C-alpha cells in the first residue's frame, strides 16, 4: 500500500495542520508500535491532507466521536491482515464528555471534581454544544478555541 500494516488503523483525509493536534489529543505517542505520519500530503479536491498510520492499534469510541468534531472529513480504516476490513467516516455524537472545557467562566464545572459534558445540537450553521451544568449553549468554534 502507500506504506502497509497487517493490523491497525489508518486515519486518512485529515485537514492540514489538524493531524498533529490529533496525535497530541489522542495521546498516540504513548505507544511502542510503528506509526507513520504523513504531514501535508496531496489530496486533489482539497490539496493538503495529513495521514496517521498506527500499526496494530484501533481507536476507542470516544476518540472516533472526538474525531467527528475535530476532523469530519477523516476516514478511519480498520485494517486487518492488510485487508481494509472497514472504512468508516465519523458522525457527530449525542454528547461529548471530559475533554471539552466550558467557555462560561462562572460555570461550576471548573472548580469541582466533575467530568464536563456537552450536548451536540447540529445547527445548520455549525455545531452548538450545550454545557451539562451551566446550561449555556455555545458555538463549537468558541468551545474548541485552542
Amino acid at each position: 500500500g502507500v506504506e502497509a500494516i497487517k493490523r491497525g488503523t489508518v486515519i486518512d483525509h485529515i485537514p492540514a495542520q489538524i493531524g498533529f493536534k490529533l496525535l497530541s489529543l489522542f495521546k498516540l505517542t504513548e505507544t511502542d508500535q510503528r506509526i507513520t505520519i504523513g504531514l501535508n500530503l496531496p489530496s486533489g479536491e482539497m490539496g493538503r491532507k495529513d495521514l496517521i498510520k498506527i500499526e496494530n492499534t484501533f481507536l476507542s469510541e470516544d476518540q472516533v466521536d472526538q474525531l467527528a468534531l475535530y476532523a469530519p472529513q477523516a476516514t478511519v480504516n480498520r485494517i486487518d491482515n492488510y485487508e481494509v476490513v472497514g472504512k468508516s467516516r465519523p458522525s457527530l455524537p449525542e454528547r461529548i464528555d471530559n475533554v471539552l472545557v466550558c467557555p462560561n467562566s462562572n460555570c461550576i464545572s471548573h472548580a469541582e471534581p466533575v467530568s464536563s459534558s456537552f450536548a451536540v445540537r447540529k445547527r445548520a450553521n455549525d455545531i452548538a454544544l450545550k454545557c451539562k451544568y451551566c446550561e449555556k449553549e455555545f458555538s463549537h468554534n468558541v468551545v474548541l478555541a485552542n
Partner: protein, 310 residues
C-alpha cells in the same frame, strides 16, 4: 405516586406543562386549606451560599407551616467549605446523610445539577444558581398570573430589564413557552439582552416575540408587565455603563394600560419602579411575593409525599 415524588427541581426545561399545572392546583388547594403537619418529622436543609430575603425566608416558613424542621446556613462563610477549603461535592455528600431534601442557592451556574450527582437519594431543589435558573420563582409567578388572568395561554407578556443575567426571566420564558399562543415583548439594554438559546427555542416552537425600545410603546398591549433588577453583582466591568435602570416605570405611564394589566417584579427592586406605582390597582409584586408560600408548600408536598389527597 405523584409524578414529582423525589424529583430534583433544577431547571424549568426538565418539568412539563403537566408538572407545572400540578403544582399550581395543589397551591391553590393549600391556600384554601392549610396542612400543618403534612411534612411532620422531616428535616430539610436550607443551604444558601448567596444572599436572599424572599427565597430563603418564604421556603423556611413553607417548611414550618407544613411541620418540617429546618437546618442550614445563610452564608458559606462559616462552613468548613468557606473556611477549611472543602469542595461543594463533599459538602453535599455529608449533608445528604442528615436530611430529607436540600434547598440550595449558589453563585456559580450549574451548582444545583452538580449537587444532585452527590446527594444520593435526597431531592435537591434549586433556589437559584448564578444567572442560570430559578424554577421556584417561576412557579410562584405562574400562580400569580393564573390568579389574576385566569389563563396561562394567549397572554401578552412584556419582560423589561436585565434579561441577560436574570435567572427569573430565563426560567419564566421557558415555562410560558409550554403554553399555547403566548406573545412576548422584550425591552432590555442590548448589552443585557435575552440569551440566543431561549430565542432559538422560541423560534423553534413558532412563538412570537419582539424587541422594543420603550415601555410606553407596548403598554396598551400587555397583560403582564414583568420588571427585573440590573444584576450588579454579576456584571462584567465592561457592562458598568449599565448599572442604573434604563427604563423606570412611573405611575403616569400606566395611563393607557388594560384594566387587567399586572405589574410584576421578582424583587429586589432598586430605582426601576417608582414607589408611586405601588398605590395603583396595577401593582401586584407584593401579592406575588406572598404567593411564594403556597407555591413552595405545593412543591415540597409533592416531592416528599408519594400521594397527596387534599
Amino acid at each position: 405516586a405523584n409524578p414529582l415524588y423525589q424529583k430534583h427541581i433544577i431547571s424549568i426545561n426538565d418539568l412539563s406543562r403537566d408538572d407545572l399545572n400540578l403544582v399550581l392546583a395543589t397551591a391553590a388547594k393549600l391556600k384554601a386549606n392549610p396542612q400543618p403537619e403534612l411534612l411532620k418529622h422531616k428535616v430539610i436543609a436550607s443551604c444558601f451560599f448567596e444572599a436572599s430575603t424572599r427565597t430563603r425566608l418564604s421556603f423556611q416558613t413553607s417548611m414550618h407551616r407544613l411541620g418540617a424542621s429546618v437546618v442550614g446556613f445563610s452564608d458559606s462563610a462559616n462552613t468548613s467549605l468557606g473556611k477549611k477549603g472543602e469542595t461543594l461535592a463533599d459538602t453535599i455528600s455529608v449533608i445528604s446523610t442528615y436530611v430529607d431534601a436540600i434547598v440550595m442557592r449558589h453563585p456559580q451556574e450549574g451548582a444545583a445539577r452538580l449537587a444532585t450527582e452527590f446527594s444520593g437519594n435526597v431531592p435537591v431543589l434549586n433556589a437559584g444558581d448564578g444567572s442560570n435558573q430559578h424554577p421556584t420563582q417561576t412557579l410562584l409567578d405562574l400562580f400569580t398570573i393564573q390568579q389574576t388572568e385566569g389563563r396561562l395561554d394567549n397572554l401578552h407578556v412584556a419582560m423589561v430589564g436585565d434579561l441577560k443575567y436574570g435567572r427569573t426571566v430565563h426560567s419564566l420564558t421557558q415555562a410560558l413557552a409550554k403554553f399555547d399562543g403566548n406573545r412576548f415583548y422584550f425591552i432590555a439594554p442590548d448589552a443585557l439582552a435575552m440569551p440566543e438559546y431561549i430565542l432559538d427555542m422560541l423560534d423553534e416552537k413558532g412563538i412570537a416575540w419582539s424587541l422594543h425600545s420603550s415601555i410606553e410603546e407596548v403598554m396598551a398591549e400587555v397583560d403582564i408587565l414583568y420588571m427585573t433588577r440590573v444584576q450588579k453583582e454579576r456584571l462584567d466591568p465592561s457592562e458598568y455603563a449599565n448599572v442604573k435602570a434604563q427604563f423606570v416605570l412611573r405611575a403616569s405611564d400606566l395611563h393607557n394600560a388594560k384594566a387587567n394589566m399586572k405589574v410584576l417584579h421578582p424583587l429586589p427592586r432598586v430605582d426601576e419602579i417608582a414607589t408611586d406605582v405601588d398605590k395603583t390597582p396595577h401593582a401586584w409584586y407584593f401579592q406575588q411575593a406572598g404567593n411564594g408560600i403556597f407555591a413552595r408548600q405545593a412543591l415540597l408536598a409533592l416531592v416528599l409525599n408519594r400521594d397527596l389527597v387534599l
